[PDB]
Amino acid sequence: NRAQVAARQHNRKIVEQYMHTRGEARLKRHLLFTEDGVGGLWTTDSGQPIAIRGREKLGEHAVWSLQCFPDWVWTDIQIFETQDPNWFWVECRGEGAIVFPGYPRGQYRNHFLHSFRFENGLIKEQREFMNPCEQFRSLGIEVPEVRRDGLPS
Amino acid sequence: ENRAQVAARQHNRKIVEQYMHTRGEARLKRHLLFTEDGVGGLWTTDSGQPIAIRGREKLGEHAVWSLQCFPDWVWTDIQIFETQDPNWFWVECRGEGAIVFPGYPRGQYRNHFLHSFRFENGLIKEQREFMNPCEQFRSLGIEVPEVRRDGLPS
Ligand SMILES: O=C(c1ccc(Cl)cc1)c1c(-c2ccc(O)cc2)sc2cc(O)ccc12
Ligand SMILES: O=C(c1ccc(Cl)cc1)c1c(-c2ccc(O)cc2)sc2cc(O)ccc12
């Protein structure tokens, strides 16, 4: 129990560090992961995650993260510990320029949930969840509209 | 203080369990798990704004529509997360069932969901569910736009 308490307190510090990582520090965020750790975006247009698998690949991906989201900041961070000392959830927002190849530069804002699962004091699995429709908007991509006439309102 | 927090968390967890396992005709009374002014709804939609049902009475009325448009809906793969706030829980799960939206072909809708439950005085003050609307678009036959990935490596 003292060990679970210790694990939770340490893991929480890693979540805080991850969520506050911005700027050039993003180039070393992958060091918060286990060697086989996975991090990525679970909510995309395809319905499949875009997951970066392995600490080395996460470090390589930071280059592309900094290209596509050059000034990204997580804001409004609320960290939730859970009964599992190795599992945390985060509710937050994120904002920054979006610079996707072949799209106009945009300003992207979204609400996010993150899941952090730990192993031996480092992140084993990070997942972020958002509404892709807001990212479509930031890219100038038309968002389909569910017709609401027949729904209660 | 800790005893009161522990008591609140244990009770609130039972309410979350009950909510997540409410199926079929019991859905018509799910609103009784809310405070009178409780709010529940879908936070992730095509508009970017929540579709929130405000007040226990309106939640009960909305259950009628819910049972018509998602007549056999179930939540599955339910994982309930207590938090350091005895009045705040998160749930990761999936949901599935027929989707019968007005003016759209009858479909089968499956999605991954996160739910947030915030409690006041032992009942739900705020329920919010979060999903990827693209999967609901697919269930309705609505074309999902595709972000071009040619310059976007993973
Ligand atoms: O926004 C992201 C994203 C993907 C993964 C991660 Cl880890 C973070 C963001 C998205 C992409 C991406 C892929 C590779 C890359 O190098 C940078 C961005 S394609 C895509 C397609 C969507 O419908 C929504 C989001 C994204
Ligand atoms: O599926 C839902 C939904 C909304 C709120 C709640 Cl509480 C549950 C489901 C959605 C809608 C709705 C509105 C009112 C109603 O009576 C039934 C359905 S429009 C819409 C539009 C979207 O792009 C995605 C989901 C929904």
Collapse the DSSP code of A147 into the 3-class scheme (helix H, G, I; strand E, B; otherwise coil) and give the result: coil
Chain-centroid distance of CA B8 in Å reads 22
CATH architecture label of B4-144: Roll (3.10)
User: What would you report as the CA-atom Rg of chain B, rounded to the nearest whole angstrom?
Assistant: 17
DSSP letter for each residue of B71-88: TT-EEEEEEEE--SSTTE
Contact in structure between B64 and A151 (CB atoms under 8 Å) = no
Mark residue B84 as left, alpha or beta (left: phi above 0; alpha: psi -120 to 50; beta: remaining). Answer: alpha
Q: Are strands A106-119 and A122-129 parallel, antiparallel or unpaired?
A: antiparallel
Q: List the domain boundaries for chain A.
A: 3-143
Q: Considering only the beta carbons, identify the residue of A89, A131, A150 that sits closest to B81.
A: A89
What's the gap in Å between B97 CA and the centre of ligand 2?
14
CA dist B25 → B67, B106, B123, B150, B152 (Å): 8, 21, 20, 48, 47
B69 lines ligand 2 (CB under 6 A): yes
| Residues B69, B98 contacting (CB under 8 angstroms) | no
Strand order in the sheet with B123-130: B51-54, B34-42, B123-130, B107-120, B88-99, B74-81
- Which ligand is located closest to the Cα atom of residue A148? 2
CB-closest option in B44, B83, B148 to A102: B148
- Nearest atom in ligand 1 to A43's CA: 24
Helices first, then strands: H and E counts in chain A: 3, 6
| Site of tokens 């439950």 | B117
Would you give the distance in Å from CA B83 to the centre of its chain? 18
Return all residues near B35 (Cβ < 8 A) that are at least 6 apart: B56, B120, B121, B123, B124, B125
Q: Which ligand is nearest to the CA of A149?
A: 2
HSE of A123 in the Cβ direction (CA atoms, 13 Å)?
29
CB contact under 8 A, B103 and A149: yes
> In the CATH hierarchy, which top-level class contains the domain A3-143?
alpha beta
C-alpha separations of A23 from A11, A65, A115, B64, B77 in Å: 22, 11, 22, 49, 37
State which residue of chain A sits closest to B63, comparing Cα positions: A152
